């Protein structure tokens, strides 16, 4: 195999670095209102807004739509990945997030490629040339399955990736002390697991329902 | 149990992120020489440098003795991981780097223990109230062992995240592209595991021997 050379157990660590240089997430974008309109104001509220949102959007567009390209990748089934890009796409407001959220995928592909002793394998070649509208979710999805990183590992690092993300902007944003950025980690290990379950459950008919 | 809200497979994961709130990791502090004196100027010359660095005092000294104080820690023998402490602490030059690695380690206690909701057990705090030169290493070990993370996952974990680091550190002081610093981390995949591997075969007698 071309990848004999390759250990998928630091690989995974690899992408899932804040270092893997394809620009920051975006999931900052909706929380600079909740900060000056005093809704986010400490540990406490901060961790609701957290749960809240990691139930919603996070849940129904991005980590299933994660789910949804993995298990098609699978499949070898570019037209149904291509048509959750499409569906994600066509759901996000507002244009500027989208362009964002385009741009961040765009980066992971590129930062996967330019990796050439890294073979991804015809099927991820393929969806490369073809997609319209990567995100980081749905393109982490297919190079997962693609890699045969198992899916319920896939998920976990790709959330506690995200989860990370998230508190420290409201570690910075709030702000809130380092301390508390941990007590909420911690605090939100029990709702992780209870998300990858759930998300494991949800299909098409649910994506981009929240 | 008290720690039935606590999934270890996230912990480690936070505790080996670069926001786990403990100051910088200290290995770039002999690198600023090497780029001085043109010795590492490029890809090929960062990698074999972090090749002979990773295989030398990291590996005799960080890797073997995270390992030791992890298995004297299932011994319950505190006076042996004391012992591994005071070996490292003897044997540490500079002065600087001694103190810069002390700080860190205590960090590392101190990150831990201000999350209250994670019981690390009785052991780990009779180490916590006995350890005068704690570092980094040596205490995740310990902390490691304390909630029963296997040992090879803790290591690999640890490795990565340390690794990391001193690749971004030649990424931004050579400085190297981004790219550069990718290809280099997933070359040292291979090399990572024959790491471990070594880690495995040591033992106190090959202590600080590098």
Known sequence: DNNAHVDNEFL???VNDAVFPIGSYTHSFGLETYIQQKKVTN???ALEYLKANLSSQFLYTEMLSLKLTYESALQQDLKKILGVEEVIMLSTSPMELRLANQKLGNRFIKTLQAMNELDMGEFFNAYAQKT???THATSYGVFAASLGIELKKALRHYLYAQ???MVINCVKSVPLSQNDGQKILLSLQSP???L???TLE???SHLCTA
Do not use: V, Y
């Open 132 to 134: 319209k509208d990567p």
């Open 196 to 198: 990858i379950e759930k």
């Open 43 to 45: 540990k406490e509220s």
């Open 202 to 204: 949800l299909d098409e």
């Open 163 to 165: 989860t990370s993300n």
């Open 192 to 194: 992780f697991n209870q």
């Open 12 to 14: 995974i660590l690899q």
